[PDB]
Amino acid sequence: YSYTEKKRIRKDFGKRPQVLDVPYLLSIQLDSFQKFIEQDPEGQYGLEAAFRSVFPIQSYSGNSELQYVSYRLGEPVFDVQECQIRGVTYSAPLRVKLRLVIYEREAPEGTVKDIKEQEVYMGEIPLMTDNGTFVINGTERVIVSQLHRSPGVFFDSDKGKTHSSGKVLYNARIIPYRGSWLDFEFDPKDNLFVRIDRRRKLPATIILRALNYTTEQILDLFFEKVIFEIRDNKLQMELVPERLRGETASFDIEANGKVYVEKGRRITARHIRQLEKDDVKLIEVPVEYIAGKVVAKDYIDESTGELICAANMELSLDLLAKLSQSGHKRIETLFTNDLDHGPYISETLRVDPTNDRLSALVEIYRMMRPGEPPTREAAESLFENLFFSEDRYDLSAVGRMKFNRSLLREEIEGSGILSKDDIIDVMKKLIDIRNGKGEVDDIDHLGNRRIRSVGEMAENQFRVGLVRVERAVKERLSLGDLDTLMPQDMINAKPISAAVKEFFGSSQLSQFMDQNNPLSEITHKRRISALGPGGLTRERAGFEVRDVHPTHYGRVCPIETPEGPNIGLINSLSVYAQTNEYGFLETPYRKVTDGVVTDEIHYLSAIEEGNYVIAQANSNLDEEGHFVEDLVTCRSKGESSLFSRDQVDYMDVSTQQVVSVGASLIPFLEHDDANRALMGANMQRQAVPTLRADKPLVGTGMERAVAVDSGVTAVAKRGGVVQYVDASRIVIKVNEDEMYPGEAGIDIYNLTKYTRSNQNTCINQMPCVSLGEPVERGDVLADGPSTDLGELALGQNMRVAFMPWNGYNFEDSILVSERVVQEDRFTTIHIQELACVSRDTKLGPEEITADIPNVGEAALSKLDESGIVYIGAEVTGGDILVGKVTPKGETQLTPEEKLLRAIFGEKASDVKDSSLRVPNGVSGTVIDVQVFTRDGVEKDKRALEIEEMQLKQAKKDLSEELQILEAGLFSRIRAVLVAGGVEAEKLDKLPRDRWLELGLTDEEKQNQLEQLAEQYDELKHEFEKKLEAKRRKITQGDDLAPGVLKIVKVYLAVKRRIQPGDKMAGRHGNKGVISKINPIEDMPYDENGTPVDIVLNPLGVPSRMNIGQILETHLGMAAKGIGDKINAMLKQQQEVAKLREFIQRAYDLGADVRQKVDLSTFSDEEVMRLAENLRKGMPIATPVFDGAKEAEIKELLKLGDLPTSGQIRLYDGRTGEQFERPVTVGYMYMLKLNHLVDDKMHARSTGSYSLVTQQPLGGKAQFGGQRFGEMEVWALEAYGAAYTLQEMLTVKSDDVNGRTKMYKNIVDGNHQMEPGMPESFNVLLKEIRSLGINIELEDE
Amino acid sequence: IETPITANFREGLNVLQYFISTHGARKGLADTALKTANSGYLTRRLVDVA
Amino acid sequence: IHIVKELNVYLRTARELSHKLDHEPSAEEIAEQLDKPVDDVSRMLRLNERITSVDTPLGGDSEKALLDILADEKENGPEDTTQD
Amino acid sequence: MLNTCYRILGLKPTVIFADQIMYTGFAYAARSGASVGIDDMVIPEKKHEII
Amino acid sequence: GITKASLATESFISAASFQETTRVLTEAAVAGKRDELRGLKENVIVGRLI
Amino acid sequence: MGHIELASPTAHIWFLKSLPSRIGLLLDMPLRDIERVLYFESYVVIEGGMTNLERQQILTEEQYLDALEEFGDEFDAKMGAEAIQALLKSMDLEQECEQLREELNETNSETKRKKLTKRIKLLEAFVQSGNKPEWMILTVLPVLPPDLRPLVPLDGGRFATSDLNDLYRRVINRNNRLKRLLDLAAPDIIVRNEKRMLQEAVDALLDNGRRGRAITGSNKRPLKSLADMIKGKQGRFRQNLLGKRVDYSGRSVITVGPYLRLHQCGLPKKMALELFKPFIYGKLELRGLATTIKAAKKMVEREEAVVWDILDEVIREHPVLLNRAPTLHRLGIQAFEPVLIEGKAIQLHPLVCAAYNADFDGDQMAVHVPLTLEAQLEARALMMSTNNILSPANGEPIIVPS
RNA sequence: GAGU
DNA sequence: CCGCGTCAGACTCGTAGGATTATAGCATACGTG
DNA sequence: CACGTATGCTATAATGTGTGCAGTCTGACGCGG
Ligand SMILES: [Mg+2]
Secondary structure, eight states, rough: OOOOHHHHHEEEOOOOOOOOOSOOOOOOHHHHHHHHOOOOSSOOOTHHHHHHHOOOOOSSSSEEEEEEEEEEOOOOSOOOHHHHHHHHOOOOEEEEEEEEEEESSSSSSSOSSEEEEEEEEEEEEEOOTTTSEETTTTTEEEEEEEEOOOOOEEEEETTTTTTTOOEEEEEEEESSSBSSOOOEETTTHHHHHHHTOSSSSSSSSHHHTTOOOOOOHHHHHHHHOOEEEEEEEEEEEEEGGGGSSSSEEEEEEOOOSSEEOOOOEEEOOEEEEEHHHHTOOOOOOHHHHHHTTTOOSEEEETTTTTTESSSEEEEEEEHHHHHHHHHHEEEEEEEOOOOOOOOHHHHHHHHHOSSSHHHHHHHHHHHSOSSOOHHHHHHHHHHHHHOOTTTTOOOOHHHHHHHHHHHHOOOOOOOOOHHHHHHHHHHHHHHHHHHHHSOOOOOTTTEEEEEEHHHHHHHHHHHHHHHHHHHHEEEEEEEOOOOSOHHHHOOOHHHHHHHHHHHHHHHHEEOOOOOOOOHHHHHHTTEEEESSSSSSOTTTSSTTTTTGGGGGTTBBTTTOOOOTTTTTTTEBBBSSSSEETTTOOEEEEEEEEETEEEEEEEEEEEHHHHOOOEEOTOOOBBBSBSSSSSEEEEEEETEEEEOTTTOOOOEEETTTTSBHHHTTTTTTTTGGHHHHHHHHHHHHBBBBBBOOOOOOSSSSHHHHHHHHHHHHEESSSSOOOEEOOOSSSSEEEEEESSSSSSOOOOOEEEOOOSEEOOOOOOOOEOOOOOOTTTETOOOEEEEEEETTTEEEEOSSSEEEEEEOOOTTTHHHHHHEEEEHOOOSSOEEEEEEEEEEEEOOSOOOOOOOOSOTTOHHHHHHHBOEEEEEEBBTTTEEEOOOOOOOOOOOOOOOOHHHHHHHHHHOOOOOOBBBOOOEOOTTTOOOEEEEEEEHHHHHOOOHHHHHHHHHHHHHHHHHHHHHHHHHHHHHHHHHHHHHHHHHOOOOOSSSSSSSGGGTOOSSSSSSSHHHHHHHHHHHHHHHHHHHHHHHHHHHHHHOOOOTTEEEEEEEEEEEEEOOOTTOEEEOOOOOSOOEEEEEEOOOOTTEEEESOOBBBEEEEEEGGGTTTTTTTHHHHHHHHHHHHHHHHHHHHHHOOOHHHHHHHHHHHTTTTTTTTTTOOOTTTHHHHHHHHHHHHHTTOOEEEOOOOSSSOOHHHHHHHHHHTTTTTTTEEEOTTTTTTBBBBOEEEEEEEEEEEEHHHHOEEEEESSOOSSSSSSSSSOSTTOOOOEOOOOOHHHHHHHHOOOHHHHHHHHHTTTHHHHHHHHHHHTTTTTOOOOOOOOHHHHHHHHHHHHHHOOOOOOOO | OOOOOOOOTTTTOOOOHHHHHHHHHHHHHHHHHHHHHHHHHHHHHHHHOO | HHHHHHHHHHHHHHHHHHHHSSSOOOOOHHHHTTTTTHHHHHHHHHOOOOOOOOOOOOSSSSOOOEEEEEESSSSSHHHHHHOO | HHHHHHHHTOOHHHHHHHHHHHHHHHHHHHHHHHHOOOTOOOOOTHHHHHH | HEEEEEEEHSSHHHHHHSHHHHHHHHHHHTTTOOOOOOHHHHHHHHTOOO | EEEEEEEEEEEEEEEHHHHOOOOHHHHTOOOHHHHHTTTOOOOOOOEEEEEETTTOOOHHHHHHHHHHHHHHHHHEEEEEHHHHHHHHHHHHHHHHHHHHHHHHTTTTHHHHHHHHHHHHHHHHHHHHHHOOOGGGEEEEEEOOGGGGSSEEEOOOOEEOHHHHHHHHHHHHHHHHHHHHHHHTTTHHHHHHHHHHHHHHHHHHHHOOHHSSSSEEEETBBBBOOOHHHHHSSSSHHIIISSSEOOEEEEEEEEOOOTTTTTEEEEEEEHHHHHHHHHHHHHHHHHHHHHHHHHHHHHHHHTOHHHHHHHHHHHHTTTTTTEEEOOOOOOEEEEEEEEEESSSSSEOOGGGHHHHHHHTTTEEEEEOOOOOSHHHHHIIIIIGGGGGBOOSSSSBBSSOOOO
């Protein structure tokens, strides 16, 4: 075990050896975007791919052309931190080297005319953070991967389109990555058609005619042949035995000298096999049989040279006789059959109005460009530019791959352009499917659904920006001068920058990162969405795609997706699942050779998975041998059953791989209903971090991995000893063996303190190490906001009892002890952000002064000279934070105010009042202020004071950097100087500033001194430039929006304590709202005196079927029982030996505990720190389906000396007498969700009204009213409450004079109704009359 | 489905039983979100005519 | 036309600046290039600020537009009317 | 019970009676001490056999 | 049926407000139809007493 | 309102595209036929005095050239909205009604009798309405008032406008260009294109995505036309007229009140302080505590101890309405006597949770204040929880212990 | 994302 | 009949603000302090 | 006259659009061929 694990070991109840560890959870994000920026030399990827796809391009004339050389990302002008504070996007400038080459017109391709080569800027591309976010306008945003139908081929059929007939019409669709769609479909008359971009329908043969296929050839492609030899007089036919099947024999079928089948007789298997065995080839047949057979090829009279019969012509007795006498004694007709080989193309040629190739091209052209006179040029060009042009069409390697595999080809990669064979083969397979051989795909199968990550999407939008600029370039190249015109003068950055900014901004997949919880971020970045551009819509979404598909096993979680309209579309990735190189999903499986289960792992794609039989993870292994049991539970072809041991090809790696990350955190998932588990996992994401990070007693194991991988915790880059711990930072000195010989080797981590989250929560990092502690690489140095010693800590476990209590836990309602509030454990921090904007108006600039009309001294006390509240100041609703004043223009003073202002003098001043104040009923402490001024406007006094702080603090920070770096660097040189000329304290006597002149003998260690000497001066000059940069940025006058002169941002911190109305829940989908905070005197308490913290209603269990919470409670109680035993032993101080005895016995409890934890390796002190942590309650890991079983939990309770039932006798705090029976009591890990009543409470009497409709506005932020909607109206109508109704329609809403009159009446007591007519109605009439419908009021 | 869930909640379902349960569960939950529109629209038509 | 053409020269100049600075230029950086007042540059960039539709629904969701939030500030409430 | 009371006694009595019933109901619910342990979920010995 | 019955009522305000509003209004405008406001819908639209 | 004088007449799209055709039904002219005429693909005969060529018979461009030399003069056939308007003007409804009624008696087939009875009722109703078919065609275009298509400045010096203003700007530009092209006596092909242009913009103004492509903004999204403001859920009726935003309303999270009696609910002090603002001011003036309205306002802002006693006085015997969404039956809204409580959530009585389907897993409810003596009485008598026990659906008590 |  | 088109598709609550392009260069002409 | 807003002319030859998305829902009810 690691050093951080020595501090607190979790007890594991798992039995299945995990052959594979969980991968880096944000793998997808990082790999993808890395590929996008990664400059690949040949195999174009991301950026490189976009350039090569478009470039090189030439002008319209063809003489001038632009070619791409190479690109480079500039380093970002502002780092992440600065970007977040300022509100700027974190991006890298994209400079691209381009070469303008011009050809001569008189010379053939005179490339040595004019070649201008230079580097042009064109847009800054947003960069991805270390943890897979993007910083856009100062907020962290995550681009969620998308899931769409893979480019390629797909066969489908509307299952009974015409509902009367209910005939199944099969269709093929070729979907490219870029281009027009090409659809093949059947009609009810079994004729094959073609459509482009679902336009009007065309006979399918028309497209083959475009590809230059004569009628003869088309039939030879799709059809087989029936040959007829005409010998002497009688007609002979060439026979294939297995054609005549399921049919009725029309004539007397005989051969040489044996009659087989009679007229009107069914031809069964036996007959066919008889005929085949006899070796029948030719059979005499009646002439009358030919009537109905279609001739395949053309036949001409050799004598005359004219057409006797054209191809695809139904044969008759006349034609046949004519053909015989011309001299043709062999006739190719179409093999064809109602059942098996259907004549589709034959019939489609009869419907085909075109003749030759050119005619076919014209008809295609006339479909898509109807009316417009066709020209041969335009038709040829159009058809080629549809699916046969490199520019406009591209299946992509994924499209070609999927296409080739669906057609059962051998080669995966190839042409992105459609070849002739490709089309034909799609038609053939479509026809095959019609005949009955083959089946249609679905769409829901993950073999047909592909995942499109961030890098590929950025790549696509970047291609678009290129294409827009390409238009502009071509246009300017044509008219442009060859000599004067520079390449960078033609290029505009704006189209590209616009396209990209629009993606990372406007796109649905790009959204505000959900960061009210580490889990929330990590799962959000592991999300997949079927929505957005190139995907489904909520409206357009069916039920088929939404529901759980067999292929989802090991790839997508079946238990993680929103219960909204986004139910089937948005989905979290399974744990072990990964992105295939082509973009499909794949899951790890352990290969089994001859029964023996090897440790080699293979990731299987969806398609590959169906081929092999895969055993479940729950099969019992025979100690590195094979399956214990002769019958094994396995699955293949999407279906599950029993198999023999040797039959098994693979097996599931982990028991966890079926579920997502979120669902894995749920202990005892196995005993919860899936519905509830879905809600539990969803609600776990909404857990708000409390003040005190409490670890969960009853965990799973995933806690540690989530916290660490999320990146919110600070982890150690290189192992070594901690040189300086601090609240603000941590300095760790690295071990010699890992410590590089170049630098000093002292790592510095500044910790991010009290910062605002997107949900207005509080993000602070705490150090979790002691000063001078030895630490291993990859250990947690500092905990993030909801983490504890490396583990995920979303909520807080507590003592729960399940019982009714006077209906205060009625319908999930929660009765909680005052103790919980007193200890402030659920109390939460919220950091809110208030801004005061000073804009420039037509009348003049708004000012941020403290000098405001009508302000009390009390109010101005907290404001400084500038008009800004001081740091630290406690505020409450109504207090002014940032004073601001605005120039008022004339106002018509009513004659009364003229008289009054003449009486009092009080002539009204030029300035008004737009000061930013504390929103009503929020109250907190101002913890930081930031000021933004434009470059030219005179700065505030307060702004100067903030800059003073920043400058001097920046100098200290950088000075400490070079000081501790200088100290660590000379400490090395001191050691190198010892290796050769050791004079330890004699060298330290004279000052360290005069040290590097001393050398050594001519050896490699003398060169080591040169390396440290070169780096020390490098660090010296580097420190100069760093500080120059810092100083510039602090001085830097910010470029804000046009109109805005200066902005002041204030950050309040509020302490929110829990209260009735707040929302709490566990991880089993058990919600509840706090109803009552009961005094601790009233709380049920056990024999020992210990009172319960929460009382939950047991009536919210059997209906819910979430039994995980009961198991959690029992295991929770046992965990705490052990904790109290350890706690008791520590208070007594027995001795190390005794603690070690108990703890060893404890760890090694379970029936087949996987993890062994021998305490003999642990030194006595290590044992003490461990026990110190375990006293609060021994933490236990229940893996998902590999969890603790009932037996194991009861055994743990006996070690706690707790009852096997887990029920204890409880006493009523009010009466003192016992409750009649035992109640289940233990620790459940619970969470306070983001839904604070504070945010929810709202009330309005009278306020602003809407613009046109005149009715009150909506929303609490705008001080809005609740909507009384149609539903709500109907209620009142039913009841017959007429006045209340009318009241809500008129005086309470639009009726303007009515509302004012009503208000006056109410203040004067008399509740008189004085109603009129709603203004919205008036508006309606006017809108109808603007339509040109006369709608008039006829009065009485 | 031809194979029903033989196990129960107290005993704990295995990976495959749990997965098999999902389908039906989710179908139900989606029906809440999606079908109530049509139920409510019926209510609206009734109301309008009465 | 005069304002439009002025604004266009400010734009073309911004483009040259942005190519060489790697970064899109500030109002004062463009002004320093033209040897002109920052207030002039600012006023022109303010005019370039293009309009938003009141009917456009907010938050990528066809839920409710700007109109739904935007009050009549001139129309005081029943409170103010009754006070008069 | 409530229905019968409504028909014989009337509204006022039923309203009072309903409140009263609510109070005593919850009151005794709590006193009972009734809760949910894993042992209440009795299994049938004939479970494995039937299966 | 319920939909057509509601659209067949003499009140075009009730009809138009329900559904099909473009068609309802062309019909009523051409017919020169007058609604004397008997029903509840109609009154609530004008903010009158039920 | 204002108006615009259109240089060329234009069809009202509602009485053209919205089926039944109305205009096509009235002329007995297929809709495609009308359109070929409107878009100037082909001419229509308005009056062929020579019975050789009859009324409403479509002629292509080359068809109009043949009879030009031959018959000419004595046949008038024209193109576009002008032609259709003229055809409409000159049709006499009375006469053709009688003619068609005569034909109805000859051999009335089932579907023929319906179509004929339809036109009969159209012609009858047209004469009864006093409407004229000319009016199907617009020469004057109305202009909606400014405040119903507002141009407002946002804080930052930004402007926001209604889409209608963009649509109107298209119409005006195209119409005024047409006037210019006529003053310049332009060739007829260009006159045609502008007339089509005008009609396209009008149609977009009235109903955008009806006829063809809806004219789009830079955002890709179709501009919101006039008809869109009346039509659908977002439309005036459904959204602003059959339902409204309402004053004296609030909302919060709900929680149990087991201690409550049946006719009561826990109402947060802070909520009730706001909801009853004017009643508090009025009582403050009767007590002579507050001199004026402004003083009373500042007194309630400061939340003085006397104000709590006054608030307690007013809320006595005053019913408040609680509502839970969705309001499926009438009991989803019930009246209660409020009991003021310190704490921000509303407390609901257990027994009526059934009716609301209210379970406290985060549910919220809306609170409404009946203002008038009439509304208060309606609430206490008809809507009080105590008074409404039985389901109106089946004769069963809905307040049942659970 | 919250109850239905 | 067939096929193409039009019409509807539950009720409240929430969060957050916000983004694109480009129109030359100069001389004469019209309206207000 | 100036300041703000508008109308105007520039002289190699150049002479029919496309572009950017849309993604295909569903059960029902009418309306020309
Ligand atoms: Mg609920």
